[PDB]
C-alpha cells in the first residue's frame, strides 16, 4: 500500500543504493520506464536478477497518459516500486506523478540514485559553478530547437558552466552523441552569431559516466567534433571562466590542451 | 595499485550504491572524510559494520597537506577506497586529489552516489532551472561574508533558482539550520537594500534528503522563519519565477500556500 519512485542509477544495476535495493527486493509488483536515459552497463534481464522480480517496462505513452490507470491502482493494496534510470526526478517530468498519486490516495517515497546532473564533478569542474541547464534536441521537420545556444550564452556571460543533456530516443534506438551536439551548435552559431560556440570554443565530453572508465575528454571544438568518445550516453559541457585548479584537472585527467592552463584573469 | 573515490550518498549507511558497498568490502583499505559534510543518519559505526572494514578517518588537515603520505602509499599495492559523504568530487577540493593519484603513479576510479546538488529534485522545482550554487556561511567576528546573497539576486533575476548550501562545523557537528540562514538573509537584505530577500520571499526547505521520510516545506519567510523542520541537515532553496507544474508541486507535496499559483508563477 504504498508507491516508490526508485533511481537505478547512471550506467549498470549496481548504481542503485542499498536502500533502493533493499526496498525494491520487498516490493510486490515492480514497474520501470527505459525511455528518459540510457543505461550502457546493463540489461534488463541483470536489473531483474539483482532485485529478483519481474519487471514490468512502461512506454512513454503508458506513464505520461496512463500512470493512474496501469500503476496506481496496485499501489492502493500492495507495494508497488516504478524504477527509473539516473535519479527518478532529475531532468526528467516524474514529479509530477506524485501529484497523481496523492489525488488517488497513494502515499509515495523517493529513493535518489547517482544523477548525471551531479556526476559532471568527475569532470573536475566546480559543480558550484554550474549554471543554468539545456537540452540539445533534434530537429525535426521544419523545426529546429536553438534555446539551448541561450542557455549557453547567458551562463558564459557569467562566467557559469553550462550542462547539456543530450537527447534521446528511445524507441527508435538513437542516442545523441557530443558529435552530434556539437554539428548543431555550429549551425545555431552560423545563424545568430553570438560568437557563443565556435571551432575555438572550449568543450567538454563526459560519455558513460558511471562506469568504472568513462570517457572525459576536453578541447576546443574543432578538434574534438570528430573525435569518437565511445558508446553513448554523452553529456556536452560547455566551461565558463575556468579556475586555475579545474583547468589544472581538464589538463591532467582529461587530456585537454596545455594552453588552457594559462587563464585569461 | 587502485584507489576508488566512493561516495556514500545522502543520509545514512544505506546510501551507498551497491557497486560502492561491493568495491569497499573487497579493499585492503578503507579511509573516509567527514569534513566535507556528515552523514546524519547513521554513525560511523553503522558503516564499519555494513562494510565490514575497519574505517581510517582522514581530518581536511590530513587530506588537504597529507593524502600522498598517508592514502596513496598503501594504494600504490593494495586496493584502497577513500569514502566521502555524497557523490565523490561535487566537492571542490576532491577532484585535485585525483591528480595527487596520477602523480604518484596511482590509478583511481570514481563510483558516484547521490548527491544533494541532484537530490533537491524532490522539491518538485526543475533541475535546469538552477542556476549558481552558494553557500551560507556564519559570520564571525567582524567578517561578515555575504557573496551568496549576490548569487541569488543574478540567478533569481534570470527566473532561475537557487540551492543554497548551509554552513556546517563538521568536527563539532553542528549544522545551520534553515530558520538560521532566513534569519541571516533577512539581515543581509537590510544592509544591502537590494529587494532579494524579504519576509515576501518565497524559499522552499528540504531537510534529510535521503531519508524515507524528508521534510519539504515551500512557503513565504514570515511564515517559515521560526517553523521546525526537524532534524538535521538543512537545504534551503530560494526559487526563481515558477513554471505553473512545480508551484502545483509545491501546493500538493511541500505544503505550499495556493497564494504562490498567483504570485509566484
Ligand atoms: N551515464 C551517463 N553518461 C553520460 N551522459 C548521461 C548519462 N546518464 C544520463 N546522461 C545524459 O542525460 C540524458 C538523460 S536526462 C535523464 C537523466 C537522469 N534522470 C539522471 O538522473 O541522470 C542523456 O540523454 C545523456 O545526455
Same mark, same amino acid.
Given at each position: 500500500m504504498v508507491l516508490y519512485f526508485i533511481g537505478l542509477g547512471l /550506467?549498470?544495476?549496481?548504481?542503485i543504493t542499498v536502500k533502493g535495493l533493499e526496498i525494491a527486493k520487498k516490493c510486490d509488483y515492480v514497474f520501470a520506464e527505459f525511455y528518459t536515459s540510457l543505461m550502457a552497463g546493463t540489461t534488463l534481464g541483470r536489473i531483474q536478477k539483482l532485485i529478483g &522480480?519481474?519487471?514490468?517496462?512502461? +512506454?512513454? #505513452?503508458?506513464? #505520461?497518459?496512463?500512470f493512474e490507470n496501469i500503476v496506481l491502482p496496485l499501489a492502493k493494496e500492495n507495494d508497488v516500486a516504478f524504477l527509473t534510470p539516473g535519479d527518478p526526478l532529475v531532468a526528467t517530468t516524474h514529479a509530477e506523478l506524485r501529484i497523481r498519486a496523492k489525488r488517488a490516495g497513494v502515499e509515495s517515497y523517493v529513493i535518489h540514485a547517482p544523477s548525471?546532473? +551531479?556526476?559532471?564533478?568527475?569532470?573536475?569542474?566546480? $559543480?558550484?559553478?554550474? %549554471? &543554468?541547464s539545456a537540452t540539445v534536441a533534434y530537429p525535426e521537420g521544419n523545426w529546429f530547437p536553438? +534555446? /539551448?545556444?541561450?542557455? $549557453? &550564452?547567458?551562463?558564459? *556571460?557569467? %562566467?557559469?558552466?553550462?550542462?547539456?543533456?543530450?537527447?534521446?530516443?528511445? *524507441?527508435?534506438? =538513437?542516442? =545523441?552523441?557530443?558529435? #552530434?551536439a556539437m554539428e548543431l551548435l555550429l549551425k545555431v #552559431?552560423? =545563424?545568430?552569431?553570438g560568437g557563443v560556440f565556435?571551432?575555438?570554443?572550449?568543450?567538454?565530453?563526459?560519455?558513460?559516466? %558511471? +562506469?568504472?572508465?568513462?570517457? $572525459?575528454?576536453?578541447? /576546443?571544438?574543432?578538434?574534438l567534433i570528430?573525435?569518437?568518445?565511445?558508446?553513448?550516453?554523452?553529456?556536452? $559541457?560547455v566551461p565558463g571562466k575556468l579556475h586555475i585548479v579545474e583547468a589544472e584537472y581538464l589538463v591532467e585527467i582529461a587530456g585537454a590542451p596545455r594552453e588552457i592552463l594559462r587563464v585569461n584573469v
Open positions: /550506467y549498470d544495476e549496481r548504481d &522480480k519481474h519487471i514490468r517496462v512502461l +512506454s512513454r #505513452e503508458d506513464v #505520461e497518459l496512463n548525471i546532473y +551531479s556526476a559532471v564533478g568527475i569532470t573536475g569542474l566546480h $559543480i558550484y559553478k554550474f %549554471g &543554468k536553438t +534555446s /539551448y545556444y541561450d542557455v $549557453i &550564452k547567458e551562463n558564459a *556571460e557569467r %562566467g557559469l558552466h553550462t550542462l547539456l543533456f543530450l537527447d534521446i530516443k528511445a *524507441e527508435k534506438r =538513437m542516442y =545523441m552523441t557530443a558529435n #552530434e #552559431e552560423d =545563424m545568430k552569431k565556435t571551432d575555438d570554443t572550449l568543450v567538454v565530453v563526459l560519455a558513460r559516466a %558511471g +562506469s568504472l572508465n568513462p570517457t $572525459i575528454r576536453a578541447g /576546443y571544438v574543432k578538434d570528430r573525435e569518437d568518445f565511445g558508446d553513448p550516453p554523452h553529456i556536452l $559541457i
